[PDB]
Amino acid sequence: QVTLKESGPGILKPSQTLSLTCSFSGFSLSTSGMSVGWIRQPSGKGLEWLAHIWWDDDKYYNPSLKSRLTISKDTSRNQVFLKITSVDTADTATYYCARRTTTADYFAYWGQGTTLTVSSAKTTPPSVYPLAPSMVTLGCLVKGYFPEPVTVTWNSGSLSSGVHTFPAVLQSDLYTLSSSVTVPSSTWPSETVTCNVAHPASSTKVDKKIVPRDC
Amino acid sequence: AEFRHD
Amino acid sequence: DVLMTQTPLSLPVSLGDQASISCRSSQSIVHSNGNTYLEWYLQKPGQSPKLLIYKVSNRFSGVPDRFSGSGSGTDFTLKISRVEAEDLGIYYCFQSSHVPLTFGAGTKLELKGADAAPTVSIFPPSSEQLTSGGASVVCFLNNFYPKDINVKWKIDGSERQNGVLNSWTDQDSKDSTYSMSSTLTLTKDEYERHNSYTCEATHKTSTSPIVKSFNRNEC
Numbered sequence: 188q189v190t191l192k193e194s195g196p197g198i199l200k201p202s203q204t205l206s207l208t209c210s211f212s213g214f215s216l217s218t219s220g221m222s223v224g225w226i227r228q229p230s231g232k233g234l235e236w237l238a239h240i241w242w243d244d245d246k247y248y249n250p251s252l253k254s255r256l257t258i259s260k261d262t263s264r265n266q267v268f269l270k271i272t273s274v275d276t277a278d279t280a281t282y283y284c285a286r287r288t289t290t291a292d293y294f295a296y297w298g299q300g301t302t303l304t305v306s307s308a309k310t311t312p313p314s315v316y317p318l319a320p321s322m323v324t325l326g327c328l329v330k331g332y333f334p335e336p337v338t339v340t341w342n343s344g345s346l347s348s349g350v351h352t353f354p355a356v357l358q359s360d361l362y363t364l365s366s367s368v369t370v371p372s373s374t375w376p377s378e379t380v381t382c383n384v385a386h387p388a389s390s391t392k393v394d395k396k397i398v399p400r401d402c
Numbered sequence: 403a404e405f406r407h408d
Numbered sequence: 409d410v411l412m413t414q415t416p417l418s419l420p421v422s423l424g425d426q427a428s429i430s431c432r433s434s435q436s437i438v439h440s441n442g443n444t445y446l447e448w449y450l451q452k453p454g455q456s457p458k459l460l461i462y463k464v465s466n467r468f469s470g471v472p473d474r475f476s477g478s479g480s481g482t483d484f485t486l487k488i489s490r491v492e493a494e495d496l497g498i499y500y501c502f503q504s505s506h507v508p509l510t511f512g513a514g515t516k517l518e519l520k521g522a523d524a525a526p527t528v529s530i531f532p533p534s535s536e537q538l539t540s541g542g543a544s545v546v547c548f549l550n551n552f553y554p555k556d557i558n559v560k561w562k563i564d565g566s567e568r569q570n571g572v573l574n575s576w577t578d579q580d581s582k583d584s585t586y587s588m589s590s591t592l593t594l595t596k597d598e599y600e601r602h603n604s605y606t607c608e609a610t611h612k613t614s615t616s617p618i619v620k621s622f623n624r625n626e627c
Contacts, residue, residue, distance in 0.1 A: 220408070222406075224509075233500070233511060233512075233513050233514050234449075234451075234457065234500060234502075234511045234514075235511070236508060236509040236510065236511070239405075239509075241406065245406065247405065247406070247507055248508075249507075249508040249509075250409075250508060251508065283456060283457075287504075289407075289408045292407060292445070292462070292504075293447055293459055293462040293468065293504075294447070294449070294457075294459055294502075295459050295468065297456040297457060297458070298456065299456055300456060314536075314537070314540070316533075316534040316536050316537045316544070317534050317536070318531040318534070318546055319531065319534070320529060320531070322527075324527065324529040324548060324550065326529075326531060326546065326548065328534070328537075328544055328546055328591075330537075330542075330544065351548070351550060351577055351587045351589075353575040353576070353577060353587075353588075353589045354575050354576070354577070355575075356573050356574075356575055358573065358593065363573075363591070364575065364589075365546055365548075365575075365589050365591065367529070367548045367550065367587075367589075369527075369550070400531070400532065400627065401626060401627055402532060402622045402623055402624070402625075402626035402627035403506060403507040404439060404440060404505065404506060404507070405439075405445075405504055405505060405506060405507050405509060407439055407441055407443065407445060407504075407505075
């Protein structure tokens with residue numbers, strides 16, 4: 188079967204060199220007409236073609252990355268490599284390798300991708316803050332953590348309905364998100380509501396009980 | 403610049 | 409470079425209806441060999457993109473016949489008949505005639521739902537955060553449809569553009585609504601220069617804005 192499998196370093200600091208590997212099986216780059224390309228996707232954003240290599244060593248590059256890209260292959264080992272020098276935050280993306288052939292001239296086969304984060308951030312626990320107000324909406328703000336992810340639950344998981352936990356966004360190299368929960372006004376504050384926030388990378392777990400605001 | 407399509 | 413412009417970027421549909429996606433190349437993508445190398449890919453959540461159509465109108469093997477490509481010159485169209493839930497995701501056109509190879513920005517095929525005004529809630533900075541010199545003001549705009557919405561922060565009645573970050577949830581798989589958070593981050597010093605804070609939402613469900621406010625001095 189035709190398969191492609193990307194691997195990479197997972198995380199790099201700005202200025203470092205990215206070395207990606209595409210290990211394939213089910214075909215050979217010694218076979219006439221064979222080619223492999225690299226395509227990336229910043230999260231929540233679109234696809235960008237980067238580079239391409241053919242069985243006879245012809246290589247094509249996207250000018251948008253200038254002299255930063257180098258594609259190569261080891262047909263003996265069934266591998267294609269992509270090197271990107273001087274990485275910066277904009278190189279944060281999922282990287283895919285994909286095959287085309289002269290007789291099947293389209294990207295029919297893709298790998299699952301390898302995800303890369305480029306950041307100078309250090310591991311940092313979140314600051315967790317209460318968001319206090321027929322139905323009532325409460326929340327918790329989870330601010331200034333790195334790396335992803337955090338997990339947020341409400342009442343240790345017993346409150347699962349009516350919850351919106353929003354995607355994290357970057358603020359000065361650190362992540363922030365909030366979670367909201369909506370419950371009947373008859374259950375709060377008469378009954379407690381607590382947000383539980385775990386950030387595995389920093390070895391932290393915090394509970395924040397929500398109490399009513401005055402303004 | 404054209405891409406390869408043999 | 410060839411720019412590939414897709415329309416629309418968001419496409420709500422009822423199940424079983426037909427969806428039509430437009431893709432226009434900024435210049436000819438007819439290769440010297442005579443073929444037009446326009447491909448369509450579908451990326452479902454958490455998955456790699458998958459091939460649907462090649463050379464404008466040729467269906468890749470295994471692709472349901474409800475997917476069909478057509479076009480002429482520089483104008484291309486992907487048609488998806490009798491839309492099923494499994495068809496939801498992001499569709500990309502792609503030209504491979506010219507280097508660099510280029511994709512369209514992607515069109516998200518999404519579901520239609522019943523109109524619903526957002527439920528809007530505003531929250532002042534917590535005392536815990538203020539102790540540390542920071543002041544985040546949070547506004548939730550929850551469970552609304554359709555997708556488009558205009559959110560403004562006002563401080564002492566005047567619009568505030570700087571320091572605002574927004575986040576959106578994926579369309580809800582149950583009620584097909586959207587939710588968003590808007591967060592205004594200030595220093596405590598900045599926060600203490602004003603008293604009235606307002607989150608204002610305008611949505612097609614009403615000609616009147618939804619306005620939620622608090623006064624700092626009452627907190």
